[PDB]
């Protein structure tokens, strides 16, 4: 401080098909989020893209980590291992691979994610949940 190493920026979920933006800034009140939700229509694929800045020094073996809960209960863990990163003036995106969203009645509805960003010595560069609702139409 007052500005760190490392700055985890913006959340995306990057969906061709949505009508709308679907971005979370990180660099706000990250408590609002888990009142809010993005929705995705039932079997859209997407991505997640990570941005974050690197300000000083090299980081190491940097990590994002997700859980996705349902109702309240742990239903998967994912990791990315996003790599080492030098000091740069822009921002730098991790892009995870393409998926779907799930599909069929019984799998619809929300679900709430808690992410992580973190490197090789466990820095908690953030921590931050939020939500997805799958839906049968936007």
């Known amino acids: 401080a007052m500005v760190p190493n490392v700055v985890v ?49 090299i980081v190491s073996g940097m990590k994002y980590i997700q859980h996705t809960y349902r109702k309240g209960v742990k239903i998967d863990k ?32 929300s679900y709430s994610i808690k992410s992580r960003f973190t490197d090789d010595d466990k820095t908690d560069h953030l921590s931050w949940e939020w939500n997805l609702t799958i839906k049968k139409d936007w």
Do not use: H, W
């Not at 009508?19 to 009140?29: A, M, Q, R, S, Y």
């Open 78 to 109: 994912t990791d990315y291992m996003v790599g080492s990163y030098g000091p740069r003036a822009a921002a730098y995106e991790f892009l995870t691979p393409v998926e779907e969203a799930p599909k069929g009645m019984l799998a619809r509805g």
């Open 9 to 57: 920026t913006g959340l995306t979920l990057v969906c061709s098909s949505a009508p709308g933006p679907l971005e979370l800034d990180l660099t706000g009140d990250l408590e609002s989020f888990k009142k809010q939700s993005f929705v995705l229509k039932e079997g859209v694929e997407y991505r997640i893209k990570i941005s974050f800045r690197v300000n000083r020094e």
